[model samples]
Target: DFHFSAIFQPTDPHHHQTEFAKVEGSEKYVEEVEVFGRQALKVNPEALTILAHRAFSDVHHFFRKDHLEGWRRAIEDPEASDNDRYVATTLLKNACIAAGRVLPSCQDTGTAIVLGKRGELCWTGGEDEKYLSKGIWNAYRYHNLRYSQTAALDMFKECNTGDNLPAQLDLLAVPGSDYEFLFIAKGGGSANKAYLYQETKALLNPKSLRAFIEEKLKTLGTAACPPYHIALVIGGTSAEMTMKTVKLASCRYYDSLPTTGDKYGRAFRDPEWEKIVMEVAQKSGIGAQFGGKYFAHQARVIRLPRAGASCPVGLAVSCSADRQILAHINKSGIYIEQLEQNPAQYLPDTSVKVDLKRPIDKVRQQLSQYPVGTRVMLNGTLIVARDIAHAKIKEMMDNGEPLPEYMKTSPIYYAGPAKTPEGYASGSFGPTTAGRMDSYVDLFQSHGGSYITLAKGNRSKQVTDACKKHGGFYLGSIGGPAAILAKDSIKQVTCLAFPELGMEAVWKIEVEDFPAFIVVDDKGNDMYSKTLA
Candidate 1:
């Protein structure tokens, strides 16, 4: 029970919560810190709720300075392609707009994750999860953020949790007086990129490990919204340990990890290896979703001591809309990591326009002729459908129904929007991961629908082949610029089907000068696959 190893085991910390079985809602401020007999501190549970609310809202609205800095670097890279620069510019603009706090940085407001290192001296009345969940409930209830959690009671059915409750809350005790917390609003796009691989001892060598890592990195694709802060864990005693390390590394939580290691066997980051990995990432040509040198803004390679027979390699990414912030509550007061409030300072002076300045038919004609790597802005109407709508339509198809006329004629975007704020045309509306709907591409296109599929990230080879066979096109929308698209690009949004699905409803939307790139073409070529190859 007292072992330090209990805190950082292999696997999701959420799964480890059974050990600390007992653990809320809010007060404006907890002015007093109840000190115990020399070695303990009692804190108000409301402080956790308040901190949770602020952390979630802040991460939703603002990005970390390091993230802003990385995007700025991409914008300033002379070697960067026009597509990269445009994406960077749009992201920077979105930062400024989202900081206004009305629109979130991304539509998938995310499942709230709270990881706390409770000090031996700090106490939160013992029911930490309850209060933390309460705070999360309050935030999702009030904010324009989306509810992405689905609760399942049976094997085949599920329902949205409504307020996005039952967040993953993990608490561990350490030898300290400060109560520290890392709050993450982990969007589905980024979380979906997490991977764990089990390998033999042969991978312990430099050569084998390098190839193994690079190969795995190649498959990360663009789904998670690179330029990523990609994390690599080379070894671990258990799969959970490797997975946990990858998670922390992506959050930059282990930034203070020693660059050197000793026989004691604590994990250490290898800067030299990190640089080599970065080189591979750049040369691999997977650049920030659409294609340059910034597939990953930074790569964290961690070397952990593993059992002689096993190497559990794990990989994860911090998406372009990276969202994690650390906070602390010491004897002084509760404090949060300050996020960049004015990312406009990072915006470049020059303007770069790549708009498709033609009518709908003309633009479609142009996109039809475009190769996989071509970048173009879109201006016109699109019918939106995400997971639920896709299933509903597929069900209708199974009932021998014909495809809708709009679906047959227009570009179909896979997306879901957050709650629209008052007077706003839309909320933080951005693309969801395209790969999730890859299975439906062939089926939908067969019925003379989904001729043009537009969303974020890479599709499977099946999609590429389907596109080639069906004379279809797949476009990549800039992933992290949801606020930019919501406020500046979307002209109108009207629900067409399954309004009961809320944000996941099928909607007809008009986009004006929205940014996108040709990711897959009628020729069956793919922008992302070439990078992997």
Candidate 2:
């Protein structure tokens, strides 16, 4: 039934020929077959490997089309502040370097996730997940990505799996005729933003719904990185289903969902409600990091019918890094998402010099003198550490141990680095969630340590009180642009303690013109509190 004859009009660019190969023997489970009716197909385990490796490689290096467009929109908006434009420009350059060098776009290279779908007729030797895992390992091993995964052996003891496995794999069998997949590298910050709540029908009304959503959205804060693409799922069958929908919606995988709902009860997107939530985020004043609009580039509102008594609402975000891509395997050959290879085209001709920022170094411009919300361009050195190091320092303090001289002198950045590439100054290095370390702020300052703190996101009110009591400062580093810092700002990195802790080890890094904004000051003023207030 397959036709080889070309009609009089033979030029259809969309039409293509399938290139398939045959494998002999039962051991070789991959084979050519017909899918649905006319789409002849070949399924192979290697196809999964090829797709995973390439998808990870692509997401690590390049932003998706919509993500790039979102940053572009921010830069091109006349209403955007000079600070906003500068941040956007810096991100654009980061994209350029990340893409050019095949470097990860963010320091937290993220936990690998794969969402897969297969047709009823599709066959791949029945070992699909295993093959896909091999592909993921290939990308992580070859690309110098960080080992962010640690096995949970117990409540306190854990060990880094070292290979960043086992990845979160969700493979579903659908009544489909093609194989499809979505690969995501979900970072710790944004993944931490996922939330689920059980509410009653009382929240289904317009007035109450608006209030409920706005209140929850405010708590999202800036820790997950802003200019976010947020997703909201309402009234799911179960909490896990709600969370899954939220993740999918955040990734735009549900973009093709129907706009209308009926008795049949499938998920549907509410554009009107979506617009309202987006507006609320804009007016909330937690703008793209400091202040101004762009806290969220967009919002999605999806409604699904659920159990009559249980209403599960979920919220999630695709963070600023926005690492994800779609791929498929078919008779024609395997293919993955097409990402922008040349991000420099998005850059503006003239560099934007941010206002309200002053050049500063560790030796000069005492941080205590800086006002809350003041922008600072930091030069010289910083001591880097995250959760483990902070806990270790807390242990030292509890034992009446003397603080290190370097810790007393240099500001500490709450972060961990990805694997450093050969001959590179550093791998992707950026600030981590600041709020996680808020409990230690008061304790650390009591010992003449942590005079100044640098990290991403908003902190708790206790941090503000501690800063006021101790005459310290908390600076907010730009959450994205890790590659930019590694390439343009960080000159040298030296490990100072716990080298066995991998990326979480304490280190001293030399930086020049590192951009940050003052979030808390000795005067008790808090940038985030004021902005969100």
Candidate 3:
């Protein structure tokens, strides 16, 4: 005799805990009928486009209750650092702005991902991917979201997809008359943070596991933004399975898993380890992309059965742009997860005022007075450029062209803007991950430009060393609050160079009351030395 068991066994398998709303008149798109003495559903493929468009559009402008509650907790917690509270308040304000629906929560609208489980009797003509992609296309095409996908024309050349298409669609077959979905808009920054490690059984013990987590968690730094919803999968049948589990865990899909594993190798959630992970996050003091408590909003730890010879572990995080939606289609109608719309209810809530209209040296001199972590409010002009723009500039310099005068004139801001709405001065323009531009810091500074740079996240020691050697500074801006930054800080925008690079083009912008902290100072000191080091 043989026993068959499913890897995952959740008590609330259908997700009864989540609340959903029906799409009005969606019932017309699906019909119940009899097929060979069995019940079945006839679904219109167009329903997928409707559901996907709404889900994607709604997710960018709103967030889950748990995410909102985490920000509130950070604000009210007496132990949180002033920087933590400030960051939390700023993110909440961004949520409020996003709720207006014109601008999204973050400029990186992200790659679309859809996890679909269709019942054997649920019929939709079998063209699920195409229909789902069209919906994702509609959302990014029609809304103020950014086109983040790129098409590889060749080994070295790439171009924007313009409509954010070719979504990641994973469809599975199950036993029922309905179709279920988990739609996620995963930003490039956070998606890059997912990691996988292969090890042996020697690392399974409590002491070694705890130490391992602490060491790896520090590597996350503040690049993808925080407070993170972290997920750690200790074992899996394969590396791919481990990675997928970790991502879903970060989305809290495994929250209802059984607390204890079974002899049959069923997966389970470990609350004890979850608590320990949370403890480590709080103690790490890498809070909310700045410093202090509340580094992570929550953590999920899962144990899965693996081959006797393998122990594959995966770690992933849901960043501040945390976007996911759950939905289902049945004979009754299409239902979608009801995200918090009136984010204003969660409202809870900086800085030295610096004027950038003056000469670059004067601004650097003013910034020199403050130590690392000193908050500053910047006003005036900024030159905006990200990865491609930096590469183009470096290529220009390599080809005997002088560094652009604009790069030398104003403080450089690492960013890209989303599609601007009608009458708005800017879109969701926020700082990108600074670490990506670390390699350019020293070179640009050596050429008498990029003396002062601004962006989010921690940089390598080389950036600190480069700033020290070149008398430069790297400022840390609050990540994950693009909508608020665009609405309150940015005043004007113009394309300065590289018109062909799309969002990666170099641009000039005027800002007011832009908030930032001196992360790397001219004296070779780094703000993350203690926490993220």
Expressed as tens digits, the lDDT of each residue in 77-168 for candidate 3 is 99999988999999999999999999999999999999999999999999988899899999999999998887999987888888888898
TM-score of each: 0.90, 0.90, 0.99
Model 1 lDDT per residue over 1-533, tens place: 33343223333432222111011222233333445445555678888888888888878887877788888898889877676777787778888998897999888888898989888867677898989888889899899988888788698576777898779898888776667788999888888889988888887788987788778888888888888998888888899978888998899777667777665677778899899888888888777777787888898888888888888888899897788877777655677777777878888782223333334344456677656667676776788998988887888888988876767767888999888899999998999899999999999888888888889888888999998887788888888889989998998999988877777888999888877778888887887776776
- Candidate 2 local lDDT, 212-330, one digit each (tens): 87799878898998889989999887889889989988987777676777655767889999999988887777778777677788999989888889999999988888988877665
- Please estimate how well model 1 matches the true structure, expressed as its whole-model Cα lDDT: 0.80
- Model 3: how large is the Cα RMSD against the reference? 1.0
Clashes of 2: 0
Q: In model 1, what are the clashing residue pairs, if there are any?
A: 10-240, 10-241, 11-240, 23-127, 23-128, 24-130, 24-131
Residue 468 Cα positional deviation in candidate 3, in Å, after optimal superposition: 0.6
Q: Lowest summed-lDDT stretch of 10 residues in model 1?
A: 16-25
TM-score rank, highest first? 3, 1, 2
Better of 2 and 3 by lDDT: 3
